[PDB]
Tab-separated table of C-alpha atoms and ligand atoms in Angstrom:
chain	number	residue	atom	x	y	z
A	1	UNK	CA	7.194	40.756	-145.003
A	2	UNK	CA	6.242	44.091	-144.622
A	3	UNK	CA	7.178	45.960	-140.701
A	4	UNK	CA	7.865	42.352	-138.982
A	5	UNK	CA	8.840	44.174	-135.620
A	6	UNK	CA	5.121	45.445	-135.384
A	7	UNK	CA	6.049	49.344	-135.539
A	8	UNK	CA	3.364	51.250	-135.015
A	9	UNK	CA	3.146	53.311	-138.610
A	10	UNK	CA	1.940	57.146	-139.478
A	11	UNK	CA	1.181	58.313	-142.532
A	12	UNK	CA	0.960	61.712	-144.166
A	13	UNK	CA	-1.704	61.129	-147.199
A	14	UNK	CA	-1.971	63.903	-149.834
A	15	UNK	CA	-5.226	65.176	-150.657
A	16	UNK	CA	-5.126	62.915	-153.295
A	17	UNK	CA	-4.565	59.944	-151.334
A	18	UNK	CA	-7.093	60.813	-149.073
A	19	UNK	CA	-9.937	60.843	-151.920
A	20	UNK	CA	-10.581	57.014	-151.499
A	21	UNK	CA	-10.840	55.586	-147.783
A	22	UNK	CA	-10.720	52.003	-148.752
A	23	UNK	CA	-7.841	52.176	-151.016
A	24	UNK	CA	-6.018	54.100	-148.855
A	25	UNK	CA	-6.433	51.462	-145.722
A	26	UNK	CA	-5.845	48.926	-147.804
A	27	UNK	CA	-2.370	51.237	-148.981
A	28	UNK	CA	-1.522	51.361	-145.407
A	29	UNK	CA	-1.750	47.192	-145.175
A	30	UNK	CA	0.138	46.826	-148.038
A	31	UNK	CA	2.924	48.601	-146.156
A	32	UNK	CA	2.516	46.234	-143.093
A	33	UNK	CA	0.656	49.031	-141.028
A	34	UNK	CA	-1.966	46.373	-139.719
A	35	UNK	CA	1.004	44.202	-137.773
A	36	UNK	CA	1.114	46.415	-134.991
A	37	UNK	CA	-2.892	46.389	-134.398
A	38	UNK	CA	-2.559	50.740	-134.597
A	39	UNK	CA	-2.137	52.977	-137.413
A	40	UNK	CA	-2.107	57.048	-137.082
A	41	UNK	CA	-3.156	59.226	-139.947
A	42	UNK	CA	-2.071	62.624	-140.435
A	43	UNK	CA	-4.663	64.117	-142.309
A	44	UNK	CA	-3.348	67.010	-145.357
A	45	UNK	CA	-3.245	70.090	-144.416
A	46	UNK	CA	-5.930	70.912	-146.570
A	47	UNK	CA	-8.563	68.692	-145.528
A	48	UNK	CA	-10.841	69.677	-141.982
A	49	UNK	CA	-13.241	67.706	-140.389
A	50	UNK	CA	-15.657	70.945	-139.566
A	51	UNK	CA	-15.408	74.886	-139.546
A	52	UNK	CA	-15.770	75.086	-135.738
A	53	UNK	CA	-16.143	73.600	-132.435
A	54	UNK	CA	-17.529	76.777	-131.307
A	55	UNK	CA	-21.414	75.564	-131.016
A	56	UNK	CA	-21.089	71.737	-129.356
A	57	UNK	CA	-22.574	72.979	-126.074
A	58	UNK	CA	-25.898	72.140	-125.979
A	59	UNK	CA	-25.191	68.192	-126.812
A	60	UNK	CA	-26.521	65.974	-123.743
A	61	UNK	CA	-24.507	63.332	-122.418
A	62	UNK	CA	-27.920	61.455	-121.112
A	63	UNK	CA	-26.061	58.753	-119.353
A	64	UNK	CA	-22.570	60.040	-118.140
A	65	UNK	CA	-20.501	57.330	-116.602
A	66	UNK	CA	-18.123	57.285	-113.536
A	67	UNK	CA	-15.412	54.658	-113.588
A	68	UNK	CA	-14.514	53.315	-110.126
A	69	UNK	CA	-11.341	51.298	-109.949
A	70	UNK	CA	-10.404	48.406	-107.925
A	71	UNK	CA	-6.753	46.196	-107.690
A	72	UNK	CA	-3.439	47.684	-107.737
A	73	UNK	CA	-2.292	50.189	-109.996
A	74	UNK	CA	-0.592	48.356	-112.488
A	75	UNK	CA	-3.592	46.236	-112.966
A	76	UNK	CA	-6.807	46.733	-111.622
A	77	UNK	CA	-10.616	46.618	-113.018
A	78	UNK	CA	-13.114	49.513	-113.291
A	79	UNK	CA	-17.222	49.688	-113.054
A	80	UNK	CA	-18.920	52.250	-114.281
A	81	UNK	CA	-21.195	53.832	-111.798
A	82	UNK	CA	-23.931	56.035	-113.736
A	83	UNK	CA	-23.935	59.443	-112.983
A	84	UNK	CA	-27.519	62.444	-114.172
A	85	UNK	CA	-27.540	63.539	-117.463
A	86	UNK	CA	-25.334	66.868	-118.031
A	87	UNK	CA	-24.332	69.016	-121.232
A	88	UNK	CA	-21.448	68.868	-123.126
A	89	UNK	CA	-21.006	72.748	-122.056
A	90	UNK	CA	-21.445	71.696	-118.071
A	91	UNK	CA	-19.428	68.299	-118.781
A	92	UNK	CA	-16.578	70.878	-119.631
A	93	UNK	CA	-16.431	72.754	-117.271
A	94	UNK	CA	-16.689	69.766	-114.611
A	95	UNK	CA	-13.270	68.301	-117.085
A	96	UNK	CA	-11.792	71.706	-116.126
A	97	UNK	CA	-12.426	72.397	-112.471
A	98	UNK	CA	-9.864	71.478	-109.934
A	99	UNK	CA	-11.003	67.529	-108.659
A	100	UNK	CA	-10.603	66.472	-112.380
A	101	UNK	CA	-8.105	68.729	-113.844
A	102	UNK	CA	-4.656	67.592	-116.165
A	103	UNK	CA	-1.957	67.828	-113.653
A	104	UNK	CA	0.298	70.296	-114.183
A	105	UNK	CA	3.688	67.880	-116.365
A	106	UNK	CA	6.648	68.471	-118.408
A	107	UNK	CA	5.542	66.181	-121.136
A	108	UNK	CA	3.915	63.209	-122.823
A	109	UNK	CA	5.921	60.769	-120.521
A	110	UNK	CA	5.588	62.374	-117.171
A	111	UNK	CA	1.520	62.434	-118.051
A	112	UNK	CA	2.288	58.521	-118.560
A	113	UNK	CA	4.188	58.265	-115.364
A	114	UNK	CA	1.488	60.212	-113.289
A	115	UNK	CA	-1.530	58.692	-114.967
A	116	UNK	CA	-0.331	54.561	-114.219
A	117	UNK	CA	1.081	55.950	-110.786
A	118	UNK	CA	-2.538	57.846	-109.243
A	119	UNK	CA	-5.121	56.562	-111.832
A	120	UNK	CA	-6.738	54.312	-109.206
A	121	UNK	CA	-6.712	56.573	-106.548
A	122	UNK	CA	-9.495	58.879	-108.911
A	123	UNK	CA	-13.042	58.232	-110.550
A	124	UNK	CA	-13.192	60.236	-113.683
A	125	UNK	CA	-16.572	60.660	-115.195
A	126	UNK	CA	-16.700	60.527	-119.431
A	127	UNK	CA	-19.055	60.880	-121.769
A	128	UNK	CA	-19.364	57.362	-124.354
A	129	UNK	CA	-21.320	55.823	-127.020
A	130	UNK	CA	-23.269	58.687	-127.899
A	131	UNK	CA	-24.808	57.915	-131.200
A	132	UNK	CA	-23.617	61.004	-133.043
A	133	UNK	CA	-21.169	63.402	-135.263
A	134	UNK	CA	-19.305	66.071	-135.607
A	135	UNK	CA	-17.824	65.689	-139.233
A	136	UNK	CA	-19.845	68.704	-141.387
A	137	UNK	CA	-21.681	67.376	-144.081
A	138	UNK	CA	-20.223	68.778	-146.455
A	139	UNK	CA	-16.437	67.105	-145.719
A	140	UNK	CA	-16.268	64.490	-148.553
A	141	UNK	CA	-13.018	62.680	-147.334
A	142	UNK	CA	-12.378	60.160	-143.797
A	143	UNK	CA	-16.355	62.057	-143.066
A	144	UNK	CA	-16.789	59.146	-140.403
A	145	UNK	CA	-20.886	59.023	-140.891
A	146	UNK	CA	-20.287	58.333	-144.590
A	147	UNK	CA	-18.526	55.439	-144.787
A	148	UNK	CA	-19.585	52.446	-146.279
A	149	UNK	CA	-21.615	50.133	-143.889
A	150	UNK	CA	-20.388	46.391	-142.547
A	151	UNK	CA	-23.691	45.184	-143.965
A	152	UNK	CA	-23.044	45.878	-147.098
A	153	UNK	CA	-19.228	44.918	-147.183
A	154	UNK	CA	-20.588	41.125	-145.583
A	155	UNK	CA	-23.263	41.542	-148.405
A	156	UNK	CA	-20.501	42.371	-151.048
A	157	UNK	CA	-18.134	39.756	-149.895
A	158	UNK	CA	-20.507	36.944	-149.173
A	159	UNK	CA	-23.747	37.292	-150.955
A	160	UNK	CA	-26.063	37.517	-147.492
A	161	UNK	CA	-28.618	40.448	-147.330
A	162	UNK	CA	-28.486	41.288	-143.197
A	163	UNK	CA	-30.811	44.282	-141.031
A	164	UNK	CA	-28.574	46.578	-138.645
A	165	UNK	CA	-26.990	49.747	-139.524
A	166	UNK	CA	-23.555	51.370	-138.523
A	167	UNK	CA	-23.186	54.526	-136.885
A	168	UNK	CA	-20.767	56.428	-135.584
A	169	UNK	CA	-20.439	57.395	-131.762
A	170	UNK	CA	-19.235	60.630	-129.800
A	171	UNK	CA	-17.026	60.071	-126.680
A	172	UNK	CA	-16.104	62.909	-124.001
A	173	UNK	CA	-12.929	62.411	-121.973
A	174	UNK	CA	-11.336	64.276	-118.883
A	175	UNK	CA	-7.809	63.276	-117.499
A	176	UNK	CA	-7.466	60.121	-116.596
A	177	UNK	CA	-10.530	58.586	-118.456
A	178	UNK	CA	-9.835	55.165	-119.288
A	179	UNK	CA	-10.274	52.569	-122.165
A	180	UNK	CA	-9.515	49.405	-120.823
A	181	UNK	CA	-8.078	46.336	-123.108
A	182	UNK	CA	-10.010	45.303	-125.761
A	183	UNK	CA	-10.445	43.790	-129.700
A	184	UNK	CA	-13.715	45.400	-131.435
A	185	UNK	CA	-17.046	43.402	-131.662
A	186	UNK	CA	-16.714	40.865	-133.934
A	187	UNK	CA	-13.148	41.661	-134.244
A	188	UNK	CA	-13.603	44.554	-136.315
A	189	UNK	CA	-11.764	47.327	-137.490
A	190	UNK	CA	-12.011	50.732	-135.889
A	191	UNK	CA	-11.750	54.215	-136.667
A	192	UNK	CA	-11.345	57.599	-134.131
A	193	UNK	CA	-10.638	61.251	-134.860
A	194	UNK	CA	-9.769	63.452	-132.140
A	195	UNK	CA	-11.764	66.692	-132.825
A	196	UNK	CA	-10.914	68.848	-129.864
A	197	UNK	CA	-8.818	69.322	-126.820
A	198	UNK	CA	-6.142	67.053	-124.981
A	199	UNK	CA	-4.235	64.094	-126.379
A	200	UNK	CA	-5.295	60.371	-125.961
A	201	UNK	CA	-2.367	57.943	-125.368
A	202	UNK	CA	-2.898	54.883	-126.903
A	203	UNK	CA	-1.402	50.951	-126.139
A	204	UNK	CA	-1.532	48.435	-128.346
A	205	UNK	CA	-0.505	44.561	-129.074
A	206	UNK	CA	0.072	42.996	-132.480
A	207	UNK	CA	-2.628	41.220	-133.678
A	208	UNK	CA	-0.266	38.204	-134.227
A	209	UNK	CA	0.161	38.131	-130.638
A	210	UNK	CA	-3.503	38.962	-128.994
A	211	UNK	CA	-2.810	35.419	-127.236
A	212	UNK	CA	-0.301	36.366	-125.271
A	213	UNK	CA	-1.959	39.207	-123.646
A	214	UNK	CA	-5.212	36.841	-123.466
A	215	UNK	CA	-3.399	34.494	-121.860
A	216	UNK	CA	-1.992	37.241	-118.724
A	217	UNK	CA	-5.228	38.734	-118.358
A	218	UNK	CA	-6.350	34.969	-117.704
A	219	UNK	CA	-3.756	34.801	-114.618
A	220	UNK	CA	-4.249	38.540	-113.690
A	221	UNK	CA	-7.777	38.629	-113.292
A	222	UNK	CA	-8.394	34.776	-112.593
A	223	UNK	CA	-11.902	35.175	-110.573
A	224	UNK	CA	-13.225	37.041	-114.538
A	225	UNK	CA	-11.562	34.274	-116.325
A	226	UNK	CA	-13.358	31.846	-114.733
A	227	UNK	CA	-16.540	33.440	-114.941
A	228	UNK	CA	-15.977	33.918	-119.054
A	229	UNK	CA	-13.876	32.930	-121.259
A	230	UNK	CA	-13.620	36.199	-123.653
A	231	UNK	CA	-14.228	38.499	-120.313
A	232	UNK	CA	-11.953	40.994	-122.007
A	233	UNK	CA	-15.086	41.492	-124.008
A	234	UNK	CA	-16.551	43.026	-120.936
A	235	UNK	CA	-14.096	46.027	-121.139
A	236	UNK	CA	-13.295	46.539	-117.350
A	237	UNK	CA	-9.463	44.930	-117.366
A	238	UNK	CA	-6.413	47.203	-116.993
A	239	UNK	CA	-2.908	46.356	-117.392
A	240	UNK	CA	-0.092	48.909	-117.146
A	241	UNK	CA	3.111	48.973	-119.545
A	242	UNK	CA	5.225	48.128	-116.466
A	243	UNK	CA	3.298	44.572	-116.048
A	244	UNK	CA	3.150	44.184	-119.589
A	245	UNK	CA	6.948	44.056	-119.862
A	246	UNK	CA	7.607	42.538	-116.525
A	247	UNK	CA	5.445	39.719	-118.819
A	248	UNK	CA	7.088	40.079	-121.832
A	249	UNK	CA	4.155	40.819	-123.605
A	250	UNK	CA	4.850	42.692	-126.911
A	251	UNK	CA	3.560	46.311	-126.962
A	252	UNK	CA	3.488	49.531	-128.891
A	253	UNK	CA	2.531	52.826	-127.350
A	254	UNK	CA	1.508	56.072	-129.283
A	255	UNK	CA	-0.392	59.765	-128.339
A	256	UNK	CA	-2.824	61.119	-130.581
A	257	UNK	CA	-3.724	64.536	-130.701
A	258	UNK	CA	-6.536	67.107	-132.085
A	259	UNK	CA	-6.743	66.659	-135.793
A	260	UNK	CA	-5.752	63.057	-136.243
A	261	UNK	CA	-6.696	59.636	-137.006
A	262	UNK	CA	-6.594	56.476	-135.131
A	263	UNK	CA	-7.252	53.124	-136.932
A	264	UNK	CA	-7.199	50.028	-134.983
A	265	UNK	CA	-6.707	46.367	-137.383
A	266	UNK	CA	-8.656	43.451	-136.446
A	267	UNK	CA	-7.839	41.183	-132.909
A	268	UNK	CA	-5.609	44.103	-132.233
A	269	UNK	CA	-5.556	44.607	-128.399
A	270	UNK	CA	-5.844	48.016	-127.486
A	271	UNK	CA	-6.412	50.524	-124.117
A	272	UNK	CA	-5.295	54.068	-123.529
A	273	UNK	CA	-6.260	57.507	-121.463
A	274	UNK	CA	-7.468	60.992	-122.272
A	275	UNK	CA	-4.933	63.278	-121.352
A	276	UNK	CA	-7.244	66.043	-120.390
A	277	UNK	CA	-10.970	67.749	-121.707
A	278	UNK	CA	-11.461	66.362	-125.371
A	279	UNK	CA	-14.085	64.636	-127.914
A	280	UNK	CA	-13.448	62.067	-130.260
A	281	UNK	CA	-15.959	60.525	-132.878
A	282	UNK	CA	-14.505	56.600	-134.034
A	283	UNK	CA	-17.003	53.783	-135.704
A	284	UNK	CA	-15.883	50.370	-136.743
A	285	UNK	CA	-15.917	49.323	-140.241
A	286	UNK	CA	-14.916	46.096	-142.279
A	287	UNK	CA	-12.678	45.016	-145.188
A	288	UNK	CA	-12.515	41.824	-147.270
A	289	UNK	CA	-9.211	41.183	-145.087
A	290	UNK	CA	-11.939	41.243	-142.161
A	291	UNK	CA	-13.832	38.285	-142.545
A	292	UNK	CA	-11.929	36.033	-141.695
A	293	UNK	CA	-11.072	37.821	-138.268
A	294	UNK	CA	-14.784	38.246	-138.108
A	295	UNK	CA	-15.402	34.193	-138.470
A	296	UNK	CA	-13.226	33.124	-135.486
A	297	UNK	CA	-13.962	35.989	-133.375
A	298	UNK	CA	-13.799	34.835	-129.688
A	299	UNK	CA	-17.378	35.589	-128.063
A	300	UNK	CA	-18.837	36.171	-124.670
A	301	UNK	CA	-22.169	34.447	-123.730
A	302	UNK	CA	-21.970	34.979	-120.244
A	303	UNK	CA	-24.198	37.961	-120.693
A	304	UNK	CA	-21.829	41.010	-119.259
A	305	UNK	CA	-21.045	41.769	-122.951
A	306	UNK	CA	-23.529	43.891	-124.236
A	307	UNK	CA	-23.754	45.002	-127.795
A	308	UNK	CA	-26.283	46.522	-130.582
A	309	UNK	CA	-28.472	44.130	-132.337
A	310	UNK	CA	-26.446	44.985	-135.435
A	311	UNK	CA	-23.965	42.602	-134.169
A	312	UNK	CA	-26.635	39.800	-133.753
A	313	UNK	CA	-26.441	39.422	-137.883
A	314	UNK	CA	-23.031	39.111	-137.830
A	315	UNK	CA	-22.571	36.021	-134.985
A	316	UNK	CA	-25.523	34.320	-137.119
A	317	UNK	CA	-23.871	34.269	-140.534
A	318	UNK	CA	-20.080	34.053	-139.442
A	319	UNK	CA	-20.636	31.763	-136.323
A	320	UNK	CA	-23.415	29.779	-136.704
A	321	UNK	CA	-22.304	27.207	-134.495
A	322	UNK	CA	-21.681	30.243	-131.785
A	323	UNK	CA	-25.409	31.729	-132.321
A	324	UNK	CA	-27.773	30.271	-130.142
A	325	UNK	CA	-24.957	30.193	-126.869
A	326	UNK	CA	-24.270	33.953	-127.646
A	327	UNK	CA	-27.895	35.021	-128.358
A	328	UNK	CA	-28.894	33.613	-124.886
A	329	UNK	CA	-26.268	35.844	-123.299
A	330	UNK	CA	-27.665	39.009	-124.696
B	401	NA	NA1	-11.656	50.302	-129.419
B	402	ZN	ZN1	-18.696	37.399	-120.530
């Protein structure tokens, strides 16, 4: 079997290789990339996702969100408090003034080290889930508003003819904005380019063992437990590295930087940071592996869990048994 210690794998596709997006993932699988829950992609040299950022300005964040922590800070929870709409242009220059700066650091590590260390102790404000893009029309390859839809790959694989549509989103980040652990709806695959500005590290656990780190979050956070039983659906929990070994969980950490790809693999657990002022564009998307992932997808009905009515289609022909619990949630 193909990377059995979960290695988080890059690859460095040709132009070539980078003319077919679902060959190439499923390339990527066939070398065992999917294990460790997080691939990166390098793109070729060649290829560019636009000819400028020089003209984002004037994009609104409507709904910019503050998140507040609470706990300790190796593992603590975070609300987001929302915050008047602002500019991409003014969001920048908040990013860049001195409350929300990147401390000055000596590297990727020390970042690390500072972030886990003071995160808490801060409420960074971030831009997410802006229905949008940044990819220029006229990029042909990894253009993440032309991929093929989930509807039609559930359609393709399993005959069914669903409504809902899938977009991609924009996401602004200053240090120390936070993506706290999570799988995708449904279990899904996801994709993320970085287009501009500081790095976002990235943690991840192997899909083979997204029980393990179910099961700490269930002691870690036991009042959320209790009140759901998929409340890492809600997005709130944080875990640092240091707990996750004390735990013995199994882990992979990786930074990405301007100019590359993320892709997460389905029921892999993942969280990270924004190093610093950046934008990244990601959208899930579905293979035949999917489906399976996508029929025993863990749900929450307690009604926290909020998601588009694109994913209603989805729980109704995968998890029929699930539908009318989960439908009352939302
Ligand atoms: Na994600
Ligand atoms: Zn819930």
């Amino acid at each position: 079997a193909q990377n059995p210690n979960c290695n988080i794998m890059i690859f460095h596709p040709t132009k070539e290789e980078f003319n077919d997006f679902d060959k190439y993932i499923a390339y990527m699988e066939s070398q065992g990339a999917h294990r460790a829950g997080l691939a990166k992609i390098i793109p070729p040299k060649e290829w560019k996702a636009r000819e400028t950022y020089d003209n984002i300005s004037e994009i609104l964040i409507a709904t910019p969100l503050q998140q507040v922590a609470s706990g300790r800070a190796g593992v603590f929870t975070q609300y987001h408090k929302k915050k008047k709409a602002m500019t991409v242009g003014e969001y920048r220059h908040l990013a860049n003034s001195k409350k929300y700066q990147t401390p000055p650091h000596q590297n990727f590590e020390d970042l690390e080290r500072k972030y886990w260390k003071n995160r808490i102790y801060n409420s960074p404000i971030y831009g997410a889930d802006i229905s949008g893009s940044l990819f220029d029309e006229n990029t042909k390859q990894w253009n993440l508003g032309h991929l093929g839809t989930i509807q039609d790959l559930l359609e393709k694989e399993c005959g069914v003819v669903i409504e809902g549509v899938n977009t991609p989103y924009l996401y602004f980040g200053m240090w120390k904005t936070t993506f706290a652990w999570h799988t995708e709806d449904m279990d899904l695959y996801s994709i993320n380019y970085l287009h501009l500005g500081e790095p976002k590290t990235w943690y991840v656990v192997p899909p083979e063992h997204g029980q393990r780190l179910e099961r700490l979050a269930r002691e870690l956070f036991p009042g959320s437990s209790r009140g759901c039983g998929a409340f890492l659906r809600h997005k709130v929990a944080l875990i640092s590295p240091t707990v996750l070994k004390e735990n013995g969980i199994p882990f992979n950490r990786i930074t990405q930087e301007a100019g590359e790809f993320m892709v997460t693999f389905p029921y892999g657990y993942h969280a990270g940071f924004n190093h610093g002022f950046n934008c990244a564009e990601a959208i899930n998307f579905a293979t035949p592996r999917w489906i399976d992932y996508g029929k025993m997808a863990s749900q929450c009905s307690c009604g926290e869990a909020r998601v588009t009515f694109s994913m209603d289609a989805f729980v109704r022909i995968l998890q029929p048994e699930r539908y009318d619990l989960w439908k009352r949630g939302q």
